[PDB]
Design a protein around this ligand. Structure first.
Ligand SMILES: NC(=O)c1ccc[n+]([C@@H]2O[C@H](COP(=O)([O-])OP(=O)(O)OC[C@H]3O[C@@H](n4cnc5c(N)ncnc54)[C@H](OP(=O)(O)O)[C@@H]3O)[C@@H](O)[C@H]2O)c1
Ligand SMILES: NC(=O)c1ccc[n+]([C@@H]2O[C@H](COP(=O)([O-])OP(=O)(O)OC[C@H]3O[C@@H](n4cnc5c(N)ncnc54)[C@H](OP(=O)(O)O)[C@@H]3O)[C@@H](O)[C@H]2O)c1
Ligand SMILES: C[C@]12CCC(=O)C=C1CC[C@@H]1[C@@H]2CC[C@]2(C)C(=O)CC[C@@H]12
Ligand SMILES: C[C@]12CCC(=O)C=C1CC[C@@H]1[C@@H]2CC[C@]2(C)C(=O)CC[C@@H]12
Lengths: 277, 277
């Protein structure tokens, strides 16, 4: 029997690279259900799949919108094996800008996709894993889920939310045989005018500085998606997986500083200087 | 000029005690706008206010539903002074139970009130604080926002979400003169049949154990609301407030263990043993 894997958010980035890495594995051990919110975006996945020569039947695409529990249930029903060995909750949205410049709908959407959509996947797929006493859940996390980043208030809110969701579930799942793990990613290679109308000139200037700083960190530290995707595989094959895997060690010093001063003052000062010099 | 304070969620608990502590201050330095989602619940606030003899005009109630940006805007307009010196984002919901037993609407509501509602308060009130270069924002946090608790997956999700929201905003607000702080609270003195239908017998049994453990921690460690409310006041009067204040030192050892093993394995094991013995 092959390992059945269901991944959300496979139109690009991590989810696309992980789906074709697993489907193309030389051992042919995995059957992958790559899900996408809109099947019109599946072309890059099929072009990457052909390039790694995934065997016929190793990869299938399903439409799955994690904002809708009916779409979640109908994709679950399309899993012909009647079981999901590995569930990868990767679907996600970013949101960048002055908090007061973000639309209310955009805010609600980031939380609904990143947080409620993961809850909807877990409600639909966990019960069967708990009953069989086996199953692996991998959740794409971010450094933004471990420490707060300026102008990413809502995005960070949603990634910190996943840390608390997963850690709470991990405490309960320990003796059930169901393993949950977050894969903590740094940056990965994957109008000024409207913002200026919704904020003050100083905040706008600080946003510019954040953006110039961010592009520089990205240019210097973004990892290839193949390297990040391999951390998922490592977590998948660990006999007793930990709650968190880190794709890089680059942000651990910032992490440790944050974690060693619970008042948060050292972190706030250090991150303001790191971003705004 | 009096310090104008606007507090959300004042029908009971922390928000009710803080509103009457501030309005009854012997110095008469504060004017409090105590807001409630449903004004039919304001009786306990007025009974507590009379008992502490808050002077006439020291305390006013406004209806404010943080799920609705129109209700947020109309309460802002009722602030006759045209300024809010201290904003207290305290409105919040709990959610307890097996993740698969929680209704989709209940999940969405906890996030919308606890997380999006705080975002809506900050969008409505921050810009004026940034323009004046002064203002204090206090957010009620929880130990459940710092570490994951079994059967509180969504509640923890929402409190961790506030940590990432506030920390992200704090990094930007540092030089603006606007101070944001989380007040980290432990427990504070403030049908089996439907759950059994939505989960397995083992999860149900574990829920019972969590509940018996929780009631015991509460009975032994719940703090009086007057003590918790005073930590808000302390943060309010600090000339250079920190990002986080802790109402107690009881959970710091668990916190430190969690923070010293980034893999999360020590935390998961220690919390499973603490709750389930
Ligand atoms: O780094 P990335 O590349 O941005 O990865 C994020 C993935 O999440 C997906 N996603 C966003 N909203 C989703 C939804 N509602 N349901 C399922 N997948 C979603 C994205 O699809 P899209 O980029 O097609 O939104 C994308 O495939
Ligand atoms: O500990 P607590 O006592 O439960 O405090 C939580 C406070 O948050 C309030 N709250 C819940 N939903 C709210 C909403 N949508 N808008 C404003 N306040 C809300 C609660 O009011 P209610 O208890 O009246 O919902 C209560 O006053
Ligand atoms: C937001 C971001 C860039 C875009 C991206 O794709 C992934 C990340 C995560 C790491 C962020 C970084 C931007 C700059 C940050 C604030 C730092 O100085 C340290 C943490 C780092
Ligand atoms: C959920 C809870 C009880 C009800 C309440 O009102 C506030 C809290 C926060 C502290 C929780 C506690 C329940 C039991 C927990 C899991 C522990 O063993 C350590 C942390 C503690």
């Amino acid at each position: 029997a092959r390992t059945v894997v269901l991944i959300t958010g496979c139109s690009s980035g991590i989810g696309l690279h992980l789906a074709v890495r697993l489907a193309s594995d030389p051992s042919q051990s995995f059957k992958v259900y790559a899900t996408l919110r809109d099947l019109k975006t599946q072309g890059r996945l099929w072009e990457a799949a052909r390039a790694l020569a995934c065997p016929p039947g190793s990869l299938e695409t399903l439409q799955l919108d994690v904002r809708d529990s009916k779409s979640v249930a109908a994709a679950r029903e399309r899993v012909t094996e009647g079981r999901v060995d590995v569930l990868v909750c990767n679907a996600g949205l970013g949101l960048l800008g002055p908090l007061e410049a973000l639309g209310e709908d955009a805010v609600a959407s980031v939380l609904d996709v990143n947080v409620v959509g993961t809850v909807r996947m877990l409600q639909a797929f966990l019960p069967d894993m708990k009953r069989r006493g086996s199953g692996r859940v991998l959740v794409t996390g971010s450094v933004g889920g471990l420490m707060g980043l300026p102008f990413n208030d809502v995005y960070c809110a949603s990634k910190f939310a996943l840390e608390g969701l997963c850690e709470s579930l991990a405490v309960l799942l320990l003796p059930f045989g169901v393993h949950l793990s977050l894969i903590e990613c740094g940056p990965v290679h994957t109008s000024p005018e409207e913002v200026l109308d919704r904020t003050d000139i100083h905040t706008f200037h600080r946003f510019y500085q954040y953006l110039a700083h961010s592009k520089q960190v990205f240019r210097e530290a973004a990892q290839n998606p193949e390297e990040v995707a391999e951390v998922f595989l490592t977590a998948l094959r660990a006999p007793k997986p930990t709650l968190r895997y880190f794709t890089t060690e680059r942000f651990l010093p910032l992490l440790r500083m944050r974690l060693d001063d619970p008042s948060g003052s050292n972190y706030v000062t250090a991150m303001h200087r790191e971003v705004f010099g």
